[PDB]
Amino acid sequence: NGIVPDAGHQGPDVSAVNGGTQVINIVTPNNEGISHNQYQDFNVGKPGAVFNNALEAGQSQLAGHLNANSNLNGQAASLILNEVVSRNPSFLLGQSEVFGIAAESVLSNPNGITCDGCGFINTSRSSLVVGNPLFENGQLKGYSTLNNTNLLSLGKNGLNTTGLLDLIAPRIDSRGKITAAEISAFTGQNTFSQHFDILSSQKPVSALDSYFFGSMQSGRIRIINTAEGSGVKL
Amino acid sequence: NGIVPDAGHQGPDVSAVNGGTQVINIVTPNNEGISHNQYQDFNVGKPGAVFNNALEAGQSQLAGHLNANSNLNGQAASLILNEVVSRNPSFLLGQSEVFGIAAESVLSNPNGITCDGCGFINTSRSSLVVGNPLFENGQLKGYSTLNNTNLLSLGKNGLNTTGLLDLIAPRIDSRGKITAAEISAFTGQNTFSQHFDILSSQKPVSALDSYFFGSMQSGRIRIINTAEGSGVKL
């Protein structure tokens, strides 16, 4: 079980279907259209993971036939926010599919995220955030990598998506091919809006250096580092 | 003589002052504030080059005391456009200084540009364009890398400026440290506005691959590649 939901009211139902593929019946979206899911563990293996954002039954790419997600109450999520609330880092070694209505997804894990041969299907924008979401009375305000020196790692087998990609972390170490419509990498200790506008920054006590090996197959690449003194190594 | 002015009406007066440092009395700016200088050769050696954009005499960093540039007719250039009109590629191995009023500079050379330990002083924005400027009845309309497969090379000794940096070429091969306030790299076969907005693009017949080794010391990096199929290698 790569993905283990939190026991609380934001923990989605997670099941394994033959092959080891995980199916996540994401929790009911709030009024902002955000399905806020909380996890003790979030890891995707080679068999992949399917997030059920479907209003009607159909064929998924990774898990075959699935019924609709009745949690949706007739309205699909605009954003699937996957928040790790434990101390466990995340490893993504396979494809994450949004089944049903295309949506944005965010994985937040302040303990670290590693993507090695991972990818995203039917996801308009995928963000990996080594940090925490920011909430104000239940409403999503943005994200934080403050007080954090952990790593977003991208392995030799790379990352693929046909949609937009955001890479947000105190530091990034990438060793493979990143394929995306657009790539946005924001490094350092920062607070962000919901749209990853940088709102504030800390200077780390020690250097937070990022490294990009390999390649980027994308028509538009942006790298923003706010750690004064720290560099981007290629 | 690294820098050799064109014989025509856009050729500036170029002199060498002791040490081998070149001093360029740039031509009178037009009504858009552009000093359009044309060259048979444009190369900067270790002693550097000083572009005289001064309304009053003073001390230059690279060439010591200089008098004002009387060509200016009381108004300094906003943009110093340095256009190579021959077949000769450019090598920049030293610092280019704007003496006097800070200005933007552009070097256009469709035959190729190599920067190895080069830099820019008192230059708010420096652009290196492996392509040609576009004119309409004397007015600068933008730039073109169409029908061009030549290289912008950045060597192991890198490039430094305290200002903005644009790198525009069919392909880029960088092997050193690029230090700038912001770095913008636009690759492929493109037409550009004066502000390097991409207006149109060609698909090259063969791959135009760019390579970035080394590092980038800059808070904001953008890489835009329009060559569909071609990649950015790190």
Coordinates of N, CA and C in Angstrom, one line a residue, chain B residues 1-160:
Chain B
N1 N 43.1 44.9 -33.5 CA 41.8 45.5 -33.5 C 40.6 44.6 -33.5
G2 N 40.1 44.3 -32.4 CA 39.0 43.4 -32.2 C 37.7 44.0 -32.9
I3 N 37.5 45.3 -32.6 CA 36.3 46.0 -33.2 C 36.8 46.8 -34.4
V4 N 36.1 46.6 -35.5 CA 36.4 47.3 -36.8 C 35.1 47.9 -37.3
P5 N 34.9 49.2 -37.3 CA 33.7 49.8 -37.7 C 33.4 49.6 -39.2
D6 N 32.2 49.5 -39.6 CA 31.8 49.6 -41.0 C 32.3 51.0 -41.6
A7 N 32.6 51.0 -42.9 CA 33.0 52.2 -43.5 C 31.9 53.2 -43.7
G8 N 30.6 52.8 -43.6 CA 29.5 53.6 -43.9 C 29.0 54.5 -42.7
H9 N 27.9 55.1 -42.9 CA 27.4 56.1 -42.0 C 27.0 55.6 -40.6
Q10 N 26.9 54.3 -40.4 CA 26.7 53.8 -39.1 C 27.9 53.3 -38.4
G11 N 29.1 53.5 -39.0 CA 30.3 53.0 -38.4 C 30.8 54.1 -37.4
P12 N 30.9 53.7 -36.1 CA 31.4 54.6 -35.1 C 32.9 54.8 -35.2
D13 N 33.5 55.9 -34.6 CA 34.9 56.0 -34.5 C 35.4 55.1 -33.3
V14 N 36.4 54.2 -33.7 CA 36.9 53.3 -32.7 C 38.4 53.5 -32.6
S15 N 38.9 53.6 -31.4 CA 40.3 53.9 -31.2 C 40.8 52.9 -30.1
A16 N 42.1 52.6 -30.1 CA 42.8 51.9 -29.1 C 43.5 52.8 -28.1
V17 N 43.4 52.6 -26.8 CA 44.1 53.4 -25.9 C 45.0 52.5 -25.0
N18 N 46.1 53.0 -24.5 CA 47.1 52.1 -24.0 C 46.7 51.0 -23.1
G19 N 47.1 49.8 -23.4 CA 46.7 48.5 -22.8 C 45.9 47.7 -23.8
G20 N 45.5 48.3 -24.9 CA 44.7 47.5 -25.9 C 43.2 47.7 -25.8
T21 N 42.8 48.5 -24.8 CA 41.4 48.7 -24.5 C 40.9 49.6 -25.7
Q22 N 39.7 49.2 -26.2 CA 39.1 49.9 -27.3 C 38.1 50.9 -26.8
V23 N 38.0 52.1 -27.4 CA 37.0 53.1 -27.1 C 36.2 53.4 -28.3
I24 N 34.9 53.2 -28.1 CA 34.0 53.4 -29.2 C 33.1 54.6 -29.0
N25 N 33.3 55.6 -29.9 CA 32.5 56.8 -29.8 C 31.3 56.5 -30.7
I26 N 30.2 56.0 -30.0 CA 29.1 55.5 -30.7 C 28.4 56.6 -31.5
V27 N 27.7 56.2 -32.6 CA 27.1 57.2 -33.5 C 25.9 57.9 -32.9
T28 N 25.6 59.1 -33.4 CA 24.5 59.8 -32.9 C 23.2 59.0 -32.9
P29 N 22.5 59.0 -31.7 CA 21.2 58.3 -31.6 C 20.2 58.9 -32.5
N30 N 19.2 58.0 -32.9 CA 18.1 58.5 -33.7 C 17.0 59.0 -32.7
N31 N 15.9 59.4 -33.3 CA 14.8 59.9 -32.5 C 14.2 58.9 -31.5
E32 N 14.4 57.6 -31.7 CA 14.0 56.6 -30.7 C 15.0 56.3 -29.7
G33 N 16.1 57.1 -29.7 CA 17.2 57.0 -28.7 C 18.1 55.8 -29.0
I34 N 18.0 55.3 -30.2 CA 18.9 54.2 -30.6 C 20.1 54.6 -31.3
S35 N 21.3 54.2 -30.7 CA 22.6 54.4 -31.4 C 22.8 53.2 -32.2
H36 N 22.6 53.2 -33.5 CA 22.8 52.1 -34.4 C 24.2 52.1 -35.0
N37 N 25.0 51.2 -34.5 CA 26.4 51.1 -34.9 C 26.6 49.8 -35.7
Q38 N 27.3 50.0 -36.9 CA 27.5 48.8 -37.8 C 29.0 48.5 -37.8
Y39 N 29.4 47.2 -37.9 CA 30.7 46.8 -37.8 C 31.1 45.7 -38.8
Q40 N 32.3 45.8 -39.3 CA 32.9 44.7 -40.1 C 33.4 43.6 -39.1
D41 N 33.8 44.0 -37.9 CA 34.3 43.0 -36.9 C 33.9 43.5 -35.5
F42 N 33.4 42.6 -34.7 CA 33.1 43.1 -33.3 C 33.6 42.0 -32.4
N43 N 34.7 42.3 -31.7 CA 35.3 41.3 -30.8 C 35.9 42.1 -29.6
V44 N 35.7 41.6 -28.4 CA 36.2 42.3 -27.2 C 37.3 41.4 -26.6
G45 N 38.5 41.9 -26.4 CA 39.5 41.2 -25.8 C 39.6 41.4 -24.3
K46 N 40.5 40.8 -23.6 CA 40.7 41.0 -22.1 C 40.9 42.4 -21.7
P47 N 41.5 43.3 -22.5 CA 41.6 44.7 -22.1 C 40.2 45.4 -22.1
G48 N 39.2 44.8 -22.7 CA 37.9 45.3 -22.7 C 37.5 46.4 -23.8
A49 N 36.3 46.8 -23.7 CA 35.8 47.9 -24.7 C 34.9 48.8 -23.9
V50 N 35.1 50.1 -24.2 CA 34.3 51.1 -23.6 C 33.5 51.9 -24.7
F51 N 32.2 51.8 -24.5 CA 31.3 52.6 -25.4 C 30.9 53.9 -24.7
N52 N 31.3 55.0 -25.4 CA 31.2 56.3 -24.9 C 29.8 56.8 -25.0
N53 N 29.0 56.7 -24.0 CA 27.7 57.3 -23.9 C 27.6 58.4 -22.9
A54 N 28.7 59.2 -22.9 CA 28.8 60.3 -21.9 C 28.5 61.7 -22.4
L55 N 27.8 62.5 -21.6 CA 27.5 63.8 -22.0 C 28.6 64.8 -21.4
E56 N 29.3 64.3 -20.4 CA 30.4 65.0 -19.8 C 31.6 64.2 -19.5
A57 N 32.8 64.8 -19.4 CA 34.0 64.0 -19.2 C 34.0 63.3 -17.9
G58 N 34.9 62.3 -17.8 CA 35.0 61.5 -16.5 C 35.9 60.3 -16.6
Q59 N 35.9 59.6 -15.5 CA 36.7 58.4 -15.4 C 36.0 57.2 -15.8
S60 N 36.4 56.4 -16.8 CA 35.9 55.1 -17.1 C 36.6 54.0 -16.3
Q61 N 35.9 52.9 -16.1 CA 36.6 51.8 -15.4 C 37.7 51.2 -16.2
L62 N 37.5 51.0 -17.5 CA 38.5 50.2 -18.3 C 39.5 51.1 -19.1
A63 N 39.2 52.3 -19.3 CA 40.0 53.2 -20.2 C 40.5 54.5 -19.6
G64 N 40.3 54.6 -18.3 CA 40.7 55.8 -17.6 C 39.9 57.0 -18.0
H65 N 40.6 58.2 -18.1 CA 39.8 59.4 -18.3 C 39.4 59.5 -19.8
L66 N 38.1 59.8 -20.0 CA 37.6 60.1 -21.4 C 36.8 61.4 -21.4
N67 N 36.8 62.0 -22.6 CA 36.0 63.2 -22.8 C 34.6 62.8 -23.2
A68 N 33.6 63.7 -23.2 CA 32.3 63.4 -23.6 C 32.2 63.0 -25.1
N69 N 31.2 62.2 -25.4 CA 31.0 61.9 -26.8 C 30.2 63.0 -27.5
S70 N 30.8 63.8 -28.3 CA 30.1 64.9 -28.9 C 29.1 64.5 -30.0
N71 N 29.2 63.2 -30.4 CA 28.2 62.7 -31.4 C 26.8 62.7 -30.8
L72 N 26.7 62.8 -29.5 CA 25.5 62.5 -28.8 C 24.5 63.7 -29.0
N73 N 25.1 64.9 -29.4 CA 24.3 66.1 -29.5 C 23.4 66.3 -28.3
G74 N 23.9 66.1 -27.1 CA 23.3 66.4 -25.8 C 22.3 65.4 -25.3
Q75 N 22.1 64.3 -26.0 CA 21.2 63.3 -25.6 C 21.9 61.9 -25.7
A76 N 22.0 61.2 -24.6 CA 22.6 59.9 -24.6 C 21.7 58.8 -25.2
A77 N 22.3 57.8 -25.7 CA 21.6 56.7 -26.2 C 20.8 55.9 -25.1
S78 N 19.6 55.5 -25.5 CA 18.8 54.6 -24.7 C 19.2 53.2 -24.9
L79 N 19.5 52.9 -26.2 CA 19.9 51.6 -26.6 C 21.1 51.7 -27.5
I80 N 22.1 51.0 -27.3 CA 23.3 50.9 -28.1 C 23.2 49.6 -28.9
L81 N 22.8 49.7 -30.2 CA 22.6 48.5 -31.1 C 23.9 48.3 -31.9
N82 N 24.6 47.2 -31.6 CA 25.9 46.9 -32.3 C 25.6 45.8 -33.3
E83 N 25.6 46.1 -34.5 CA 25.2 45.2 -35.6 C 26.4 44.8 -36.4
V84 N 26.8 43.5 -36.5 CA 27.8 43.0 -37.4 C 27.2 42.8 -38.8
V85 N 27.8 43.5 -39.8 CA 27.2 43.4 -41.1 C 28.1 42.6 -42.1
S86 N 29.1 42.0 -41.6 CA 29.9 41.1 -42.4 C 29.5 39.6 -42.1
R87 N 30.4 38.7 -42.5 CA 30.3 37.3 -42.3 C 31.1 36.8 -41.1
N88 N 31.8 37.8 -40.4 CA 32.7 37.4 -39.3 C 32.0 37.2 -38.0
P89 N 32.2 36.0 -37.3 CA 31.6 35.8 -36.0 C 32.3 36.6 -34.9
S90 N 31.7 36.8 -33.8 CA 32.2 37.6 -32.7 C 32.7 36.8 -31.5
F91 N 33.8 37.3 -30.9 CA 34.3 36.7 -29.7 C 34.5 37.7 -28.6
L92 N 33.8 37.5 -27.5 CA 33.8 38.4 -26.4 C 34.6 37.8 -25.2
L93 N 35.8 38.2 -25.0 CA 36.7 37.6 -24.0 C 37.0 38.6 -22.8
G94 N 36.3 39.7 -22.8 CA 36.5 40.7 -21.8 C 35.3 41.6 -21.5
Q95 N 35.4 42.6 -20.7 CA 34.3 43.4 -20.3 C 33.9 44.5 -21.3
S96 N 32.6 44.7 -21.5 CA 32.1 45.8 -22.3 C 31.5 46.8 -21.3
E97 N 32.0 48.0 -21.3 CA 31.6 49.1 -20.4 C 30.8 50.1 -21.1
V98 N 29.6 50.5 -20.6 CA 29.0 51.7 -21.1 C 29.5 52.9 -20.2
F99 N 30.3 53.8 -20.8 CA 30.8 54.9 -20.1 C 29.7 56.1 -20.1
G100 N 29.4 56.6 -19.0 CA 28.5 57.7 -19.0 C 27.1 57.2 -18.5
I101 N 26.1 57.6 -19.3 CA 24.7 57.3 -19.0 C 24.4 55.8 -19.2
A102 N 24.0 55.1 -18.2 CA 23.6 53.7 -18.3 C 22.6 53.5 -19.5
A103 N 22.8 52.4 -20.2 CA 22.0 52.1 -21.4 C 21.8 50.6 -21.6
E104 N 20.9 50.3 -22.5 CA 20.7 48.9 -22.9 C 21.7 48.7 -24.1
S105 N 22.2 47.5 -24.2 CA 23.0 47.2 -25.4 C 22.5 45.9 -26.0
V106 N 22.6 45.8 -27.3 CA 22.4 44.6 -28.1 C 23.6 44.4 -29.1
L107 N 24.1 43.1 -29.1 CA 25.0 42.7 -30.1 C 24.3 41.8 -31.1
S108 N 24.2 42.1 -32.3 CA 23.6 41.2 -33.3 C 24.7 40.7 -34.2
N109 N 24.8 39.4 -34.4 CA 25.8 38.8 -35.3 C 25.2 37.5 -35.8
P110 N 24.7 37.4 -37.0 CA 24.0 36.2 -37.5 C 25.0 35.1 -37.7
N111 N 26.3 35.4 -37.7 CA 27.3 34.4 -38.0 C 27.8 33.6 -36.7
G112 N 27.3 34.1 -35.6 CA 27.7 33.4 -34.3 C 28.3 34.4 -33.4
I113 N 28.1 34.1 -32.1 CA 28.7 34.9 -31.0 C 29.2 33.9 -30.0
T114 N 30.5 34.2 -29.5 CA 31.1 33.4 -28.4 C 31.4 34.3 -27.3
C115 N 31.0 34.0 -26.1 CA 31.3 34.8 -24.9 C 32.0 33.9 -23.9
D116 N 33.3 34.2 -23.6 CA 34.1 33.4 -22.7 C 34.9 34.3 -21.7
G117 N 34.3 34.5 -20.5 CA 34.8 35.4 -19.6 C 34.4 36.9 -19.9
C118 N 33.4 37.1 -20.7 CA 33.0 38.4 -21.0 C 32.0 39.0 -20.0
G119 N 31.8 40.3 -20.0 CA 30.9 40.9 -19.0 C 30.4 42.2 -19.5
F120 N 29.5 42.8 -18.7 CA 28.9 44.1 -19.1 C 28.8 44.9 -17.8
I121 N 29.2 46.2 -18.0 CA 29.3 47.2 -17.0 C 28.4 48.4 -17.3
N122 N 27.6 48.8 -16.3 CA 26.8 50.0 -16.4 C 25.8 49.8 -17.6
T123 N 25.3 48.6 -17.8 CA 24.4 48.2 -18.8 C 23.2 47.6 -18.2
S124 N 22.0 48.3 -18.3 CA 20.8 47.8 -17.6 C 20.3 46.5 -18.2
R125 N 20.4 46.3 -19.5 CA 20.1 45.1 -20.2 C 21.1 44.9 -21.3
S126 N 21.6 43.7 -21.3 CA 22.5 43.3 -22.4 C 22.0 42.1 -23.1
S127 N 21.9 42.2 -24.5 CA 21.4 41.1 -25.3 C 22.4 40.6 -26.3
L128 N 22.5 39.3 -26.4 CA 23.4 38.7 -27.5 C 22.5 38.0 -28.4
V129 N 22.5 38.4 -29.7 CA 21.5 37.9 -30.7 C 22.3 37.4 -31.9
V130 N 22.2 36.0 -32.0 CA 22.8 35.4 -33.2 C 21.7 35.4 -34.3
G131 N 21.6 36.6 -35.0 CA 20.5 36.9 -35.9 C 20.7 38.3 -36.3
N132 N 19.7 38.9 -36.9 CA 19.8 40.2 -37.5 C 18.7 41.1 -36.9
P133 N 19.0 42.4 -36.8 CA 17.9 43.4 -36.5 C 16.9 43.5 -37.7
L134 N 15.7 43.9 -37.4 CA 14.7 44.1 -38.4 C 14.4 45.6 -38.4
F135 N 14.4 46.2 -39.6 CA 14.2 47.6 -39.8 C 13.1 47.8 -40.8
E136 N 12.3 48.9 -40.6 CA 11.3 49.3 -41.5 C 11.4 50.8 -41.7
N137 N 11.9 51.2 -42.9 CA 12.2 52.6 -43.2 C 13.0 53.3 -42.1
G138 N 14.0 52.7 -41.6 CA 14.9 53.2 -40.7 C 14.6 53.0 -39.2
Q139 N 13.4 52.5 -39.0 CA 12.9 52.3 -37.6 C 13.2 50.8 -37.2
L140 N 13.7 50.6 -36.0 CA 13.9 49.3 -35.5 C 12.6 48.6 -35.1
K141 N 12.4 47.4 -35.7 CA 11.1 46.7 -35.5 C 11.3 45.5 -34.6
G142 N 12.5 45.0 -34.5 CA 12.8 43.8 -33.7 C 14.0 43.0 -34.3
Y143 N 14.0 41.7 -34.1 CA 15.1 40.9 -34.5 C 14.6 39.6 -35.1
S144 N 15.5 38.9 -35.8 CA 15.2 37.7 -36.5 C 16.4 36.6 -36.3
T145 N 16.0 35.4 -35.9 CA 16.9 34.3 -36.1 C 16.4 33.3 -37.1
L146 N 15.4 33.7 -37.9 CA 15.0 32.9 -39.0 C 16.1 32.4 -40.0
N147 N 15.9 31.3 -40.6 CA 16.8 30.8 -41.6 C 18.3 30.7 -41.1
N148 N 18.5 30.4 -39.8 CA 19.8 30.5 -39.2 C 19.9 29.3 -38.3
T149 N 21.1 28.6 -38.3 CA 21.3 27.5 -37.5 C 22.6 27.7 -36.6
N150 N 23.1 28.9 -36.6 CA 24.3 29.2 -35.9 C 24.2 29.3 -34.4
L151 N 25.3 29.3 -33.7 CA 25.4 29.1 -32.3 C 25.8 30.3 -31.5
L152 N 25.1 30.5 -30.4 CA 25.6 31.4 -29.3 C 26.3 30.5 -28.3
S153 N 27.6 30.6 -28.2 CA 28.5 29.9 -27.3 C 28.9 30.7 -26.0
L154 N 28.7 30.1 -24.9 CA 29.2 30.7 -23.7 C 30.3 29.7 -23.1
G155 N 31.5 30.2 -22.9 CA 32.6 29.4 -22.5 C 32.8 29.1 -21.1
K156 N 33.8 28.4 -20.7 CA 34.0 27.9 -19.3 C 34.2 29.1 -18.3
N157 N 34.7 30.3 -18.8 CA 34.9 31.4 -18.0 C 33.7 32.3 -17.8
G158 N 32.6 31.9 -18.4 CA 31.3 32.5 -18.2 C 31.0 33.9 -18.7
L159 N 30.0 34.5 -18.0 CA 29.5 35.8 -18.4 C 29.0 36.4 -17.1
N160 N 29.3 37.7 -16.9 CA 28.8 38.4 -15.8 C 28.2 39.8 -16.1

